Design a protein around this nucleic acid. Sequence first.
RNA 1: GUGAACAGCCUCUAGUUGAUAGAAUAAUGUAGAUAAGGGAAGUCGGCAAAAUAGAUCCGUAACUUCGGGAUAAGGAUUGGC
RNA 2: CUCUUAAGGUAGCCAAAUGCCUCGUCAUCUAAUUAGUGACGCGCAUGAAUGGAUUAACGAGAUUCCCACUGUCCCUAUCUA
RNA 3: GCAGUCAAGCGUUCAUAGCGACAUUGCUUUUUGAUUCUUCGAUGUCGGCUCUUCCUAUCAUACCGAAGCAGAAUUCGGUAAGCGUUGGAUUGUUCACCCACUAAUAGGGAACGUGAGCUGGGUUUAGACCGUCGUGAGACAGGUUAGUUUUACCCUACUGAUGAAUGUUACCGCAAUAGUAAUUGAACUUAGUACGAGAGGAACAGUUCAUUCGGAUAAUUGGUUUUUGCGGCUGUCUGAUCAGGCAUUGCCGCGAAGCUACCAUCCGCUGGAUUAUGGCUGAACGCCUCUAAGUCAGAAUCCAUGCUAGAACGCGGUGAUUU
Lengths: 68, 386, 134
Amino acid sequence: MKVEIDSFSGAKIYPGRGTLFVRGDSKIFRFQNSKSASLFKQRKNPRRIAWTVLFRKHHKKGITEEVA
Amino acid sequence: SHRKYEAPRHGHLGFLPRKRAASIRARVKAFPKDDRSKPVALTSFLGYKAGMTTIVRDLDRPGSKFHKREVVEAVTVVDTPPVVVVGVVGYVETPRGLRSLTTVWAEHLSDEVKRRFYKNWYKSKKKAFTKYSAKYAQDGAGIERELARIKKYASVVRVLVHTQIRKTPLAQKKAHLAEIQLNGGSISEKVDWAREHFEKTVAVDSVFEQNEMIDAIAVTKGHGFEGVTHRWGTKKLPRKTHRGLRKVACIGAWHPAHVMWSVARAGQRGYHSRTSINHKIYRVGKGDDEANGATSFDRTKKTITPMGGFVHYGEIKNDFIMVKGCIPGNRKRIVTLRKSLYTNTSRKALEEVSLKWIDTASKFGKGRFQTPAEKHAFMGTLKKDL
Amino acid sequence: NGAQGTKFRISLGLPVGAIMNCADNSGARNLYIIAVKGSGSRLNRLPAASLGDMVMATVKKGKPELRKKVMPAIVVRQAKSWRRRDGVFLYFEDNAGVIANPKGEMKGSAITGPVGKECADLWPRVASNSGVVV
RNA sequence: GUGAACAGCCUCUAGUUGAUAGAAUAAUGUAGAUAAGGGAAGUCGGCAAAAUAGAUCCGUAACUUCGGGAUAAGGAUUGGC
RNA sequence: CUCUUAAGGUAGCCAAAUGCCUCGUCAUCUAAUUAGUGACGCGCAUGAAUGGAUUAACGAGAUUCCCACUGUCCCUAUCUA
RNA sequence: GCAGUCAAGCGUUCAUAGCGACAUUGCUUUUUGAUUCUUCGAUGUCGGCUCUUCCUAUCAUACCGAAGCAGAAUUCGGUAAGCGUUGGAUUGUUCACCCACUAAUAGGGAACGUGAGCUGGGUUUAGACCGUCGUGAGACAGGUUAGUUUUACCCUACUGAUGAAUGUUACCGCAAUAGUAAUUGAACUUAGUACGAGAGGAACAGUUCAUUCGGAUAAUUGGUUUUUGCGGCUGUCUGAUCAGGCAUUGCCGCGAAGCUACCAUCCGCUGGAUUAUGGCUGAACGCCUCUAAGUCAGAAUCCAUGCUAGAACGCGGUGAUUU
């Protein structure tokens, strides 16, 4: 199988444990849960959501890994 | 006169009278027909429903669009700690049925069955079988005498099995006890299997195998007094109705000038004893494996229990089935896994498994991890650390 | 009639009275369900359609030579969350269908939008006329 | 005080804390709410409920007793520093 | 031209809150309409201050359709006092 | 309303495949009448809604016979009510017609079932309008519009729940009895085969799926949120801060637990006797004959298996039985 990633958080997605959302053209998004789904529908911004991957990857926070 | 639009009966008349079962433990109202050409083996086993989780596997049903493809099916877990035999039982045949003769027992019966046969343990004297037990101090004269009498008679025979409940995390210091009928030939072998197993335990590992069908016998979950619509799915009345709408309108006609049994009245939903069938086993394991969550395809060390523990239960540290799907009763409830009364020729009983992967994640939350290892791998250094 | 196989159960989301968008190039803008082809009967149960079900529908928005008559149709997209055995719960953002004959041939020559796998696998002409799929 | 405002919401002064009470928390009710997807198919009948709702700006038809219709319809904005 | 008895329904208006036969006939709306609207008229029994025809605004009036809106409904479910 | 009988004749020929005139025997009480026995010191009198049951004069599903049956589709008929018998437009409607799906969209009964169960649209109080009739008051199975739907705590019935007495108390069990539930279709292959001049066009076996119904269950998904759990926001009060209160749960996002959805998932058995019907042997009747004896198979039938309860006066077994 393929542990998918959350389109809003990049958290990891095992089978059954969430949802798929086909945008109206073909753009797919995978969701772990109604939480991330509702955020997506609210059109919220993960780079500003203080706590996802796409937040800290932007923020150069605690990666401490690219200089090894 | 002529209900305008013919519609079908609500509810099932056979599963009446929807009353409370006499006990949480569900009787076995019939057993597998014996094939007197085999060793003696039990026809059932006892355990505790523990929950569920999500296994993944591949299909082997040609004919399917999902043939040879992965499927995310549903499995319920039964904790099946090995159950110990402490008696056997006779049944002679009459025009009134299988009438009993003796219920013969072992010697060093545990506090658990001694507790079962009381109600107020700590201030009783704990004196149940004292004299029947001292009767073992001899050679075992009447012991073997009735063993012989049952060898003679007893067209049917049942071993008496009490659970090793102190194992499971339950706080019930009492072990449920019950009969299981034997279906080998060779009455001598029957009774001697019994006897050698006196004070000995047995496990499903000796009774069940993968990809085999069982049946589940237990009590429905308790829902209390409840009304007509939800008990029978009857159509809710409109919002405009005077005096309630979660009701039935016509509870009967004028003639017959009474109210019939066929009619949906309020009452008790639940604590019914039910017998669901044809549930296929998916895995039969033990306490030692640190890594049942590791499989043929999974190697990450993690057993069946999910993170944080099963809900309302505690953790499986003993033997276990994962069997398919829905099995009556809720968690902590006793259950009988009986085996069938006929052969499946389904192709579905026989489409075996190659399991692939399990969610081992907290059902007390929306678990997005499998291990605390994975947990730390995913997030990492906490402001708490070192 | 004319189906390329069978259909696994699918969560129903398009009852009667529903209006879905047409996703072909027939000349329509809306499709109004009135019946469903299988639609086993029951008292005060609305016939429901789902992805890949053939129905009968009409136009409310489109051409004068297209509206005001009944025509069979086929669903392609469905916002009603359903399940595939592989555990993915998936849903489109919209509800969408196409026009057709009793055998499963569209009046169309292309589509404007994504499509459902089951409808594609069961209706070959729709799959052909499809561009992107899911 | 908010706010257009004696609205509604909170509060100072003054006055009350008085309408049998305790334990549970089944159906059924009364009253209050939320609900996937669809959207009046229910129903005699869109009864009841939901939506909208203030203020600023733009925009504002038919018909007209030229006074009106008109807040028409219909759009956008509103926070704090 | 003439009888009734004095005259013989004018302008307008309609299956209208007035029309039996009647779900009138035509069109339109609609998948489909005993509903609605617009026309027809030898109108059982329309009609001129027993007022006719019309009509802006107003209507806790009656009625039809449309948009949004929705637990009305498909189909129930759950929560609170 | 439904069914029979005889047979003129249709049916190319042919009375009887299917029909059936002239006549005639009947049944039912789902039509309307006829009568007025009950009830006028009162039975709540339309329809629909919802819910159960019952009947067969079976529309479909199961098995069969017959044909003007080559196959397909259909028509006649027999066992049979076990399981089903729809969503909607207009109408107050029953009825009626239309649309459409359907396997099928059969008829009906139960105080024209069902108002202390609803609604109350209509009818049928008073109010108001129109037309016609009447001098007039007023009338009109003529039209329109607005118009309070009461009470269960009693007995029974039902549904669920307890319960004395059986020497006590506890444990495991039996099973009389009562009920019973599964249904239906499609696709693939069959097979473009059989069949047929072709047009067209099957079935069986077998696999996958599905509808309707039912019984459970919550891992997932979804719904729910007083976890008043986290956060945010408005207004005001606590001097400010933090931290807080009130706003009949203050509102919003999230939201586990728990409850629930065909909005989710799982599952839903096989053995015997029988119907019609077809056959064996086989006379009666020296032949024949499924029958008179006897007998074989055979249905969604019946009864068992299994499923539910467990008789509170049906039963067994077993253990402890008072400083």
